[model samples]
Target chain A: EELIKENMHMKLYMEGTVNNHHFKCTSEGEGKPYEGTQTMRIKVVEGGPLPFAFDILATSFSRTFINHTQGIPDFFKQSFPEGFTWERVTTYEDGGVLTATQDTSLQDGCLIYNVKIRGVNFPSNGPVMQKKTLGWEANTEMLYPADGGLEGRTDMALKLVGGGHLICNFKTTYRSKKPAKNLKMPGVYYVDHRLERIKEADKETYVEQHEVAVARYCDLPSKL
Target chain B: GEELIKENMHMKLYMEGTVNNHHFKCTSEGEGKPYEGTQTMRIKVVEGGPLPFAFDILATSFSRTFINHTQGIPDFFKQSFPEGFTWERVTTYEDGGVLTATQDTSLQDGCLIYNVKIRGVNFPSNGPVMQKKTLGWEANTEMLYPADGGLEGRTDMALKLVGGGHLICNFKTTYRSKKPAKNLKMPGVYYVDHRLERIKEADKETYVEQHEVAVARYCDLPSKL
Candidate 1:
């Protein structure tokens, strides 16, 4: 009778550009993808001088591209039609430096990669707590995927307090063989969403890219 | 003569007022002995509305080691803490709302202070599905470096978000490789001898201390439907 107590769940798939407009999305399989559901809800504590303290909340995230693709320009699908929802409330400290790194070009010989997670992000459909908005993300994950899947890299700098200064970067991969009994984790093998919109006091710069995939909401089974 | 010895090392400070009755002291006589002893700090501050604040300090030794800047300076330096630590608080609940945090550690005279505070709840968009607005706030303070003293660090911060917008920052600095004679003690702007009422003199002294201020300026209040 549990309705909401999630920890992890994914079934996503995406495809590039946004500010240069180009699209592709998924949640199930096959073409015309995009349905929604990418959950998370964590809570770990005990961080005084730093040993571990957490807060990773993103309960039922989003991803939708209804109405297939076509040049894509409606102010970039009305900027976040209903995608981009994980409103900042960060607090991460591992005083221990959260160490552990070894990538034989992406796991297979020494895979135990802790990370660096700093938080604060909101914008992409803005206006709910507007004032320009706030942004910050300096993540780095790979918690433990010795082939079970899940890799990470994120160095975001969201649309400044409310204006220009967008620099989103992500590089996640998933390659599993086990671990997905309703989101035990491990499903997705490509996630490269690059973006850049810096107007450094009027120097100007703009770019965007995206490539993602995920599955396991009871194995929808259909597309690749 | 090298521009009057760089203008007598140049150091300046000015004060306005208000810092309530404050008293802070510190000590560490090799109780756990790591690299020996030394730590120090002195403080003063003022606040105003619409994101405004002021700060002051006096130090002899400090540094809690934590330097990270991608567009500032000091490329990187880390030392979260571990060595007789203290102060802690944590509260959680993310799905429905609520989140709180507090962290602190102290030692005044020998200087080495660190502070952290946070309040949470944020989720914009509510046209399709998303709603919950309660504003967010953050506070941070750090002061380090002191084995003998000339003060070389200090930081203060205040942030508010949840659609209200706000930002406030403060910084302090000082340096001295010795050469301001007469029982040297850097960090300028002094004159309280009132017949040995406090003691401070070096005939127009100056060895170090520089102030920094930040105020991004705020604006919001144009939405009526």
Candidate 2:
């Protein structure tokens, strides 16, 4: 069936809690350059302020990607290897606390894109349920073809296009577009999760844990 | 500040856009091997365009897994859930299996995600394919056509890559901690006012709540084994 509209609701835990993200997405272009729009809302049913509600327009423009493949991305090496690192974040001993210098200056201070969770470390000797958030951020270099006029968010002032604030973590770099070799966290972007089964007969499902081409949990069209 | 930049590299991709903030706060427990993570980004066009370059937050994806099992499994994993497994498990081990899925989306409209992965051999890879092997996993935004199917209306970029080849895939999906993304972040440490019982300030109740958000574009520029 040629999928038309979908209201996919994703679940995530920020501070170790059941925080389901609702998304209401609508699409068009049963052909090339298919276009559409989305709107999202925020909710804290798991006891926020009881009336904690806020949302924003998921995406504000039309764009494209992956029409082609270049080569294995440098970042991919961090995940796929000849032999497993043998160490898992939780299933294994995870990250090291960074030095203030390294912390702020990592990736030239622009990109601090290093992420993960320790779920495999759920319990010591029995069946367990776990949840972890994995994340990363990097600065990009707008290429020559780039007129420096992109369609996404660029932090210059305290713009609140998404009902949020521009974090003044470190230095603010304007270098745009595709990362050449080691791009810092100039402008960040990310997807969600994974379906990892530590138990053998552990049948798993990876519904959301995805990439750029996704709608937010708050934007998925449920009723429509 | 050690400084991070190359401002000389300013480029422009998309233009004339809208924006949104999809931030939700929820809680989930573990089963066996636990499951969780979120991937999302933001964007902003330049003033060069009719509507000067600005930031437009892009949405993201999220996934959670919980495994339920007893003793004697694989020696590979060291950590399990908390308590006699009261907690959940995390994703360990990487595979050589290639899960071919696909995805597509426009700035204005929504997105379509599809990848490739077989039954046993491989697992699907999404977001930024990572391999720190630490408890850390996440991805950043750029321009990726992860695979080959559709873009610019080419259609049939086939999110359904049934009969595929072989390879291993891994990914770390957390995005940003900016504004709403960060704003939405539940505090790792809270002040549960006890008033009287054990009310000596209780100084600390530490936990973990990390997040980030940015605006970028493109999709998987798929790779193979």
Candidate 3:
């Protein structure tokens, strides 16, 4: 039962890339490109006297538009409109509670029913035409954490396609009750590299991979 | 004191007919005979609160056809044409705002009106032919009324010069309002009559000359009365 409960509080760190990056354009010069990222945490608990257990956390996205022009630092100002800038940031917070039966030793695993709410904030920055304004909204939905085969897994991977086309893969570690104290550090981490090209049919093509990380502190055990 | 006057316009046509004695005899073997009939038509403008005042406004047109038929005769004949067809001149006082344009073509008063008269023809035949005649009249009105500084009111009577022959008269009336009527009085009624003097030559055909008269009563409130 403790293991089951621990598995409910899991944290996940994910990084992905928006390939075909050449197709993505920004008003901030030629090299300017569009990109995005998100992170999530999941938690679980058995229902007893309390009506529900909750899964709550924050997620954010950052995209960079490179200035390909000469004599300008990659981050130098551009003539693009203020929301059309070189970099943009979007952040969202989600919170919800799950209800489940507490019978241990009864092996259907635990059935957790969750209802969640989410909100997003957009903040932009850069040049005049390229200057970024923050606080734009995106579409959102309420979700159940354990619906389908999502329950009991220690790690899960997701791929977002279209609208800036990004492929994300990550692992989530679950803990019961409280999470480890050392894992409470908050910040972003990134791994930089390029694709490896292999020749086939007398032509060369690059195999794609990306390494990136974002972390947040949570009082409860959760998975990302 | 200002004259609170309202003007309305319309057009119409009337048709009259006589039963054919020879046709009746031929079908009935001399047992039945046809009778004579006549009908009058008046096209008047619609009346309501603020009388629409205007220069070029179209009203309504009305046509009535009557026939005389007897036993054994499948066809009917016409006797007289619409009598006293007249288009009273309509003028508006400056009080009411300009008249609004309308596209309604239903037969109603206050609305633009058309009056027509047909003589020497009977039903069925007269009905279909009259429709054609009205179509032509409509086209003519569309062309001419707009050009005549916009028709306030006008009337025209035409007589057939050949064949079994007939007479067709078209009349139109216009409407205008002086001041918006806080309350409006019922429209006045009018009676119109026409005289036809027959002229004949021995062993020849018969023809007639036409004359017309129109009578109208103007309604007034206690103050004006």
TM-score sort, best first: 1, 2, 3
Q: Candidate 1: which docking quality band?
A: incorrect
Q: Is the docking of candidate 3 incorrect, acceptable, medium or high quality?
A: incorrect
Mind giving the per-residue lDDT tens digits that candidate 3 earns over B1-225?
001101222323221111100010000000111123222222212222111111012222121111232232221011111111122221111211111111111133422222221111111223323222221111121101211211232444333323443334443333222212333222223222222122221211111111111222222346743
TM-scores of all models? 0.23, 0.17, 0.13
lDDT at A55 for candidate 3?
9
Q: What CA RMSD would candidate 1 show? A: 22.7
Q: What are the candidates' individual DockQ scores?
A: 0.02, 0.06, 0.00
lDDT value for model 2: 0.18
Query: Considering summed lDDT, which 10 consecutive residues are worst modelled in model 3 chain A?
Result: A19-28
In model 2 chain B, which range of ten residues has the least summed lDDT? B149-158
B34-67 in candidate 2: lDDT tens per residue?
A: 2111122122222222211111111112111111
Compose the digit string of candidate 1's lDDT tens values, residues B1-225.
111111111111122211122222222211111121111122222222111111111221212221222122211111112221222222222223222333344333333344433332331123100222322222222322322333333332222324443232233333222223233322221110000001121212111221111111111111111
- On DockQ, the candidate that comes out on top is 2
DockQ of 3: 0.00
Second chain of candidate 1: TM-score? 0.19
DockQ-based class of model 2: incorrect
Better of 2 and 3 by DockQ: 2
